[PDB]
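Assemble and predict.
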Amino acid sequence: MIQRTPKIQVYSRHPAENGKSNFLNCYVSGFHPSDIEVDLLKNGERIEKVEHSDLSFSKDWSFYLLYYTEFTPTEKDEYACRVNHVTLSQPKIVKWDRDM
Amino acid sequence: MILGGVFXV
Amino acid sequence: GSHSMRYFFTSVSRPGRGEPRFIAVGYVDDTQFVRFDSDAASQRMEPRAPWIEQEGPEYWDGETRKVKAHSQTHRVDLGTLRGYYNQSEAGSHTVQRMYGCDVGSDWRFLRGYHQYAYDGKDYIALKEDLRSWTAADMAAQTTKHKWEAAHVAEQLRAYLEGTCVEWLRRYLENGKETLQRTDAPKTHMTHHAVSDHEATLRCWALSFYPAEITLTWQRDGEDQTQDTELVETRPAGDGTFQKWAAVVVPSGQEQRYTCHVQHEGLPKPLTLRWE
C-alpha cells in the first residue's frame, strides 16, 4: 500500500538557555501509515514523561505528531529523538541542535 | 460543533 | 481576515487487535479545542482550548454522543471498504475524514468541504458546489451512488452553511483573545561557518500565529529557491509556530543575500540582511 517516511525536527519551544525551564519538541510529519514509535532521549536514555499531540493529518492525507517534554537545558546534557516507522530500515536518531 | 449525522460508505 | 472550522477523524482497523482506533480533533484555524480518543479513559469529547472549557454539560454530552456515532460509523466503514477491495481480514487499514467550513472577513459562509481517504489516498470528496461528488476509483463510485441515493450531500450542505458557520462564529467571539489575534513572527538570522570558505545563513520566524507564512532567500534580488533549505512549519507547543529557511553562502558574500518574511501579522514584508 502507501508508505510515507516521517520528517523529523528536534527543537525547543523557546530558545534554549542553560538553567531556564523549557520544552523539548520532536515534531514528526509527512508519514503514512500511522503506526510510529517516537522517543526522546536524555544522554541516550529514553525519557519517560513524554506527551504527544492528537494524531491529525495534512492536505496530502499524511500524518503529523508533536512529542514533547518539559526540560531545563544544561551545558553538558545531550538530547535526541529516536524514530521508528515502517519506512525506516532501523530506528533513526536525530540529535537536538541547540545553536541553530 | 461536529456533524449530527449518520451516513454509512 | 478569514477563518475556518475543521474536524479531522482517523480510524485504523486492528485485526484481532480489539476495536479499530478512532481519533477525532477539532480546530478553529490553527488552534484546537476538541479531541476524542477511543483508547483514552474518559470516552468523552475533551476540551483542548481554554475558551471552550466552560461550554456547559449540554454541549459536552451532545458532542460526546455525536462523536461516538462517528466512531461507530467509521468502524462499520473499515469493513465495507475491506469488501470493495476484497482485502483480507489480517491487515491494518486506514480511513481518514475531514470536513469543515471557511468564512471570510465578514464571517459569512465562504466555502464548505467534505473529504474522505482510504489507506492514505483520495476516496471521495464533496465538490465546491456541495451538490456533487468526486469518486477516486471504481469502489468510490458505489459510495457515490449510495450517497446520491440518500441525499447525503444535502444533509452535509445544511451542516456546512448553518451549524458549522454558526458555531465557528460563536467560538471566534468566545475565544477572541486567542482566535482573533495575529502574532507576527519574531525574526532573526544566524550565521555558522561550514568551512573557511562557506557559511550557513539561517532565517528564523518564531512565535507566529497563524501558521501560514512565507520565508524566502534572495541573492541580489534573485530568488534562491533551488538552493534554499526549508523546514515544514512546526508547532511550538504554546499555540504558536516556527519555521526556518537556510542557504549556504560563500564566505564574504553574506551581504548579497536577503531573507523575506511574509505573514498576515506583519504590516508589510520583512527584508532581512546579515549586516
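Chains B and A do not touch (no CB pair under 8 Å).
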